[PDB]
Amino acid sequence: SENRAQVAARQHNRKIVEQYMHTRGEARLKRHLLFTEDGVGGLWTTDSGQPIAIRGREKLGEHAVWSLQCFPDWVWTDIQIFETQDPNWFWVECRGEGAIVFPGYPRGQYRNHFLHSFRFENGLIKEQREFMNPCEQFRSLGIEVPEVRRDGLP
Amino acid sequence: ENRAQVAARQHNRKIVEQYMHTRGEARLKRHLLFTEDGVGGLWTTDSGQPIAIRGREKLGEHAVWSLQCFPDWVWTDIQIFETQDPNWFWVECRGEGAIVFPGYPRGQYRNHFLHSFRFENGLIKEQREFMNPCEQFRSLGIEVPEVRRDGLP
Ligand SMILES: CC(C)CNc1ccccc1C(=O)c1c(-c2ccc(O)cc2)sc2cc(O)ccc12
Ligand SMILES: CC(C)CNc1ccccc1C(=O)c1c(-c2ccc(O)cc2)sc2cc(O)ccc12
């Protein structure tokens, strides 16, 4: 029953995506338990052009300690979960917001639009990736955003 | 109900495939894949507001400018994702080509992209693309600010 197995995987994996996206507050300290032991999470859109990949369940748990300090009230909002033809691959469109308390920058408020990719193995997240426009994070940190000159464009 | 959803998804997938493969002079007719009131454009920009091109006529005009400023643009590494909504698709891909922006040195632009396609009655109602604008800054010779990471693990 290939189809039955795929349907079961997709329904379970959707519940894990829902739980990830709704993880807030102190529960963030245990979000890494939604990953495989060698699972990877992180931010694929950064200033430098290289992803910030947090590799393995142990490092993901450490990242959560940092995130609770630097993003103390972070929430995902406007959550739309997309199943796909691959029962082990989901996409999520959402927004996120909260205070930003980044080391060495003034405290501020950060709001952005996000896309997330979730790939699963044996019922847990093998790879989570998030994609956003870093210019909005620059603005939240008081960093000047470059302005493309548009005079020559329609 | 299921038969109508399956029919829609299979047809719409072919339109996404056609859109993603469109290059060269065929770009001048890509707007014909949209509804008359369809919208396309870039949702991730320096200013923080989307550049939305509204209506099939304006989309056709944009293609003229695109062939000037991105004369050889190709989408590569195309992965199409169907969803539970037969009228909504996502695409993960890369793109590459010369960038010839007015008042900037000619450059080469490469980036990773996500696209969203929503359909109505067999045609694209809304196309949106999402990327990291910092790579487009680099292709234009624009300095990218650097977030200080010393205080981070
Ligand atoms: C709740 C979310 C808004 C948290 N966000 C992140 C999530 C995952 C990875 C990195 C970040 C992040 O915020 C950035 C850096 C960072 C590096 C090391 C580290 O241990 C912690 C954070 S460096 C950098 C540069 C940018 O241009 C944008 C973001 C980040
Ligand atoms: C093949 C693709 C790489 C084409 N790309 C675009 C697609 C749709 C919309 C805008 C762009 C674009 O490239 C930007 C601007 C632009 C504005 C008006 C116009 O008629 C033509 C282009 S302004 C700006 C600022 C940025 O920071 C990044 C991109 C753009």
Numbering used by the authors:
A (entry chain A): 11 to 164
B (entry chain B): 12 to 164
Sentences reproduced from the published study:
PhzB in its homodimerized form displays binding sites for two substrate molecules (2) in each monomer.
Most ligands interacted similarly to the parent compound RAL. Representative examples of 10i, 11a, and 11e are shown in Figure 4A: the 6-hydroxy group of the parent scaffold forms two hydrogen bonds with Asp57, one with the side chain and one with the backbone, respectively. Most ligands form a hydrogen bond from the 4′-hydroxy group to Pro164* and thus lock the C-terminus of the second monomer in the same way as the starting compound does. Like many amino acid residues in the binding site, both His73 and Trp76 appear to be highly flexible and adapt to the ligand’s position. In contrast, potency is improved by attaching the alkyl chains via a nitrogen atom to the 2-position of the benzoyl moiety (11d–f).
